[PDB]
């Protein structure tokens, strides 16, 4: 009970931290930025293939390979261009929750309510795709699943801790700790130095895979954060809580700079983007269509209305040509 | 992974023979099926195609209707019913299997070669160049011509390289513009545009020595080029 | 009797009708309930219904404003006019009965048809109907059957290859009518049985009631709106009486007026009812 | 009473950081969207001849 | 003509195409059961052509990823449950030891699945009805 004071005369002498360089907010800072004015996009591309709800797509970084997990039981890579099928790997359950394709395009992961990470290997001899490893050591839903760039994975679970394994060997090599609640986002850093993850609890922390420390730790939600993203430059990142108000903070600044929230909407969000410049911030609520807001302004710049169901995952390419949905009607889209 | 096959030796012109393919070590099923002879010392030829699921059959004009090629997917083994022989069809046939889907490497392996003896216009490929003698070290540029522009509206250039080395079954060096296949030393690079191709090999090896083969597959049937040969 | 307001009344009713059904169907079945299978096949019957009577009204003003035979030179018209009648009123029948089977063989084999009822599946059965329905139209043309203007000239009459051709479509009618009521009484049944067995909740038994009103009240308007014309029919083969096929006409025609009230208007009433 | 004392040195750690006048940081973010204006496909549209789509 | 290869690339999309729904037919003659009150544990047993797929399960975030299961099984709250905007649709069966069907436990095991057998085809009716345009 001793250490519950000092938690008190920290947790103020934070918040007092903070407030120190409050001096301004980026609505007004940014008044005179011209609007980017109305952005209409239409549906070039409507893949079709699968047979339920589609919970977790991710972009090749060729910009052009696209996987999409459902629960088929059953991931699909996709062409985008041409809409073929490159794929069809069979899950052995089919509770899948996220998916992630490998930045080198060989492996692509998958993983839910299993609470098991698998490995595919897609680039192989006799043409097969094989389970090249099965992550276990988690102890709750596997929420979310990313690619470092040097074919290690970083996992986020749901009994409140997010974890660094290694594919070539199979056991984890760091563990994420101080969440309260279940994990619910996860978002690399573009240079893969940093990432950040949002829980049950109304906070993202921030956490660094090199030597594994808990760098800051962002508040202001009033709700479970259901996704997040970062910035272009990676300095700043917006995340979407289930209250409909996405909420943009700044690493160095340690505090919430901008809110985008709209009362026509009460549902939550469940998906975040930003465009290649950082200027357009997509968001996926549970009103079945999208919102293209601006980063700049918190003013509604389209909508990608014309999905059935809720907007479940939502992706950018990495040259920004693209944009792609995928709602529960069992339909992914491919919008520019 | 092997892809042997059985068969061959001296028919009597005019008969009929049956090759057959067993392959084991990976999915046949789900791979097209190419079937390539090589005259005793003449070059490579295309023969015919099937499909992956028998969906579409194709044949080389000078084996049109007389040759047949069927798929057994559960027993793993292809076959070739081989009618009216000549005494052109002599040749070393090699199975060959390739997989089609966006940024695969078709032709990869090739089978191991069954010898068949006979006793006694579209698109054309040209490699003006014999035995070219080098030694080791030193840097070889192998020059391709195409009747056709290789380049497609996709941005896909059509053009596969392949080296054949004594007494073994030719094998997949390039499959585009600088697109190195599984297995391959870094030494060799492709390049060129249009209908001019060029491969290069840096720091030339010992193993390296044979025949370089180039390959068109912007549209059946597929033409190989005049074999362009090194020596040592 | 010889009225010349009546086709106008029939027109004015039928196309507000079908104006009608496509307006809330069309509105609908995005749905945000799914139900797109249902809606599309009362879609087309409504849009059928509205073509076929902007089809054939048209002759029959036609030939009160001509002061029909002098008229008319040639017989394309006569001919036209009979053919959209003779494949329209059949196909009406036929998607009829085979939305009435589909509803039976979802309660008996309720398992495999989720798997085998599909939004696209049911359009390839709606549309083969229409090819059946002007293949038989396509039977005058060849010489099978000849159409005969009779009284009061305002709708051509088969003529009775011509003696089969009235039994044929006797028979044809007939098959339709009874292939509902199989399916219809068996369906209806089915739920009675099955109401009585798990009795032994109020909730449930609502549907139970609101079932027999629906599909018995489809059954009566569809047997008697149709039921002189088999009569008419059977009388022709087995031989002042014309009053009543001027009239029995006019009496399938209202169907077709009262065919999407049924499925669709019923309801916007039903639902203030509670 | 683990949960307390890693607790404390948890919030030590987030303290003592040194954070910017949020003047700068978003001038900085704003800068950034400008930069790239030009290169987003999406904040403007792109003729057909070099769309993929 | 303006495909080389991608013809078969297109091919081979045909031929995924087809598996996806031949497998896709499994599932649609499939019911799957939620029990309520590591990983997740299936048990699958046949009974006459319907290869049951019973399978067993903060807390409340993982009831989005369950909708659309045929039933809700209770062995023994369940007010708030059934109000949760996502089971409001879905029957509830328990066991003692939306229509509400609850039944008493017996020594034979037939008697027991015949039960769940029944509860799980009216349920399959209610949809079939209100997606025929009925109800």
């Known amino acids: ?336 | 992974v092997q892809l042997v096959e059985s068969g061959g030796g001296l028919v009597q012109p005019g008969g009929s023979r049956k090759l057959s393919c067993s392959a084991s070590g990976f999915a046949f099923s789900s791979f097209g099926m190419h079937w390539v002879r090589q005259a005793p010392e003449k070059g490579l030829e295309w023969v015919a195609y099937i499909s992956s699921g028998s969906g579409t059959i194709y044949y080389a004009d000078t084996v049109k209707g007389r040759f047949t090629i069927s798929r057994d997917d559960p027993k793993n083994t292809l076959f070739l019913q081989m009618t009216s022989l000549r005494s052109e069809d002599t040749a070393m046939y090699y199975c060959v299997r390739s997989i089609y889907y966006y940024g695969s490497s078709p032709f990869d392996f090739w089978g191991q070669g069954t010898t068949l003896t006979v006793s006694s216009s579209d698109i054309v490929m040209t490699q003006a160049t014999s035995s070219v003698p080098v030694t080791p070290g030193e840097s070889v540029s192998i020059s391709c011509r195409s009747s056709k522009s290789l380049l497609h509206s996709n941005g896909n250039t059509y053009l596969y390289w392949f080296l054949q080395r004594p007494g073994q079954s030719p094998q997949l060096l390039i499959y585009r513009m600088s697109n190195l296949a599984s297995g391959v030393p870094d030494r060799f690079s492709g390049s060129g545009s249009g209908t001019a191709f060029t491969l290069t090999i840096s720091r030339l090896e010992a193993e390296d020595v044979g025949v370089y083969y180039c390959m068109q597959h912007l549209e059946y049937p597929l033409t190989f080029g005049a074999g362009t040969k090194l020596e040592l | 009797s010889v009225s010349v307001a009546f086709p106008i009344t029939m027109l004015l009713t039928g196309f507000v009708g079908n104006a009608l059904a496509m307006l809330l169907v069309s509105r609908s079945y995005r749905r945000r309930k799914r139900k797109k299978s249902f809606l599309l096949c009362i879609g087309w019957l409504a849009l059928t219904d509205l073509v076929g009577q902007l089809l054939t009204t048209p002759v029959v003003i036609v030939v009160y404003l001509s002061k029909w035979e002098h008229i008319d030179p040639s017989g394309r018209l006569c001919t036209f006019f009979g053919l959209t009648m003779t494949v329209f009123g059949l196909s009406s029948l036929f998607i009829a009965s085979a939305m009435a089977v589909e509803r039976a063989l979802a309660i008996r084999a309720p398992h495999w048809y989720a798997s085998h009822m599909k939004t696209r599946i049911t359009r390839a059965v709606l549309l083969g109907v229409w090819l059946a329905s002007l293949a038989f139209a396509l039977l005058p043309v060849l010489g099978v059957g000849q159409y005969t203007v009779q009284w009061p000239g305002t709708w051509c009459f088969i003529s009775t290859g011509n003696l089969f051709f009235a039994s044929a479509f006797a028979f044809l009618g007939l098959l339709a009518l009874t292939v509902t009521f199989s399916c219809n009484l068996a369906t209806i049944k089915a739920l009675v049985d099955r109401c009585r067995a798990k009795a032994t909740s109020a909730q449930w038994g609502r549907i139970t009631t609101e079932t027999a009103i629906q599909l018995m009240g489809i059954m009566l308007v569809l047997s008697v709106c149709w039921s002189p014309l088999l009569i008419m029919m059977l009388k022709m083969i087995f031989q002042k009486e014309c009053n009543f096929f001027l009239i029995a006409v006019r009496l399938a025609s209202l169907n077709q007026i009262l065919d999407p009230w049924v499925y669709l208007l019923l309801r916007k009433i039903l639902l203030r009812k509670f | 009473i683990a949960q307390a004392r890693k607790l404390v040195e948890q919030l030590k750690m987030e303290a003592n950081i040194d954070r910017i006048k949020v003047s700068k940081a978003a001038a900085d973010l704003m800068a950034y969207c400008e930069a790239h204006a030009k290169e987003d496909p999406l904040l403007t549209p792109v003729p057909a001849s070099e769309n993929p789509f | 003509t303006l495909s080389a290869e991608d013809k078969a690339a297109v091919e081979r999309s045909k031929m995924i195409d087809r598996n996806l729904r031949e497998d896709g037919e499994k599932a649609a003659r499939e019911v799957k059961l939620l029990l309520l009150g590591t990983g997740i544990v299936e048990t699958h047993f046949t009974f006459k052509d319907l290869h049951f797929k019973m399978f067993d399960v903060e807390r409340k975030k993982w009831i989005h990823c369950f909708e659309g299961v045929t039933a809700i099984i209770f062995c023994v709250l369940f007010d708030s449950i059934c109000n949760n905007k996502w089971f409001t649709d879905t029957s509830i069966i328990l066991f003692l030891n939306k229509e509400i069907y609850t039944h008493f436990t017996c020594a034979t095991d037939t008697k027991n699945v015949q039960f769940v057998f029944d509860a799980v085809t009216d349920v399959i009716i209610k949809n079939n009805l209100k997606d025929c345009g009925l109800f």
């Open chain 1, 1 to 336: 009970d001793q250490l519950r004071q000092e938690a008190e005369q920290l947790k103020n002498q934070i918040r007092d931290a903070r407030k120190a360089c409050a001096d301004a907010t980026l609505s007004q800072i940014t008044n005179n930025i011209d609007p980017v004015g109305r952005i209409q996009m239409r549906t070039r591309r409507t893949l079709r293939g699968h047979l339920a709800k589609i919970y977790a797509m991710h972009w090749g970084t060729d910009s052009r390979l696209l996987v999409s997990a459902s629960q088929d039981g059953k991931l699909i890579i996709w062409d985008s261009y041409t809409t073929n099928k490159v794929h069809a790997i069979p899950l052995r359950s089919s509770w899948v929750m996220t998916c992630a394709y490998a930045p080198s395009g060989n492996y692509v992961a998958c993983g839910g309510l299993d609470n098991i990470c698998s490995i595919y290997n897609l680039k192989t001899r006799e043409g097969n795709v094989r389970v090249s490893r099965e992550l276990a050591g988690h102890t709750g839903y596997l929420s979310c699943c990313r690619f470092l760039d040097d074919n290690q994975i970083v996992t986020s679970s749901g009994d409140t801790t997010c974890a660094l394994w290694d594919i070539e060997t199979g056991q984890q090599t760091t563990t994420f700790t101080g969440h309260t609640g279940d994990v619910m986002s996860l978002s690399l850093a573009p240079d893969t130095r940093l990432f950040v993850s949002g829980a049950c609890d109304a906070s993202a922390k921030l956490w660094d895979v090199r030597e594994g420390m808990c760098r800051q730790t962002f508040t202001g939600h009033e709700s479970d954060i259901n996704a997040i993203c970062f910035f272009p430059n990676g300095n700043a990142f917006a995340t979407g809580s289930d209250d409909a108000t996405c909420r943009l903070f700044d690493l160095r600044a340690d505090q919430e700079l901008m809110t985008y929230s709209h009362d026509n909407i009460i549902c939550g969000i469940t998906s975040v983007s930003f465009s290649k410049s950082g200027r357009l911030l997509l968001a996926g609520y549970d009103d079945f269509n999208c919102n293209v807001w601006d980063a700049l302004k918190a003013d509604r710049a389209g909508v990608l209305a014309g999905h059935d169901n809720r907007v479940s995952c939502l992706g950018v390419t990495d040259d920004g040509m693209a944009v792609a949905t995928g709602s529960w009607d069992s339909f992914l889209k491919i919008w520019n």
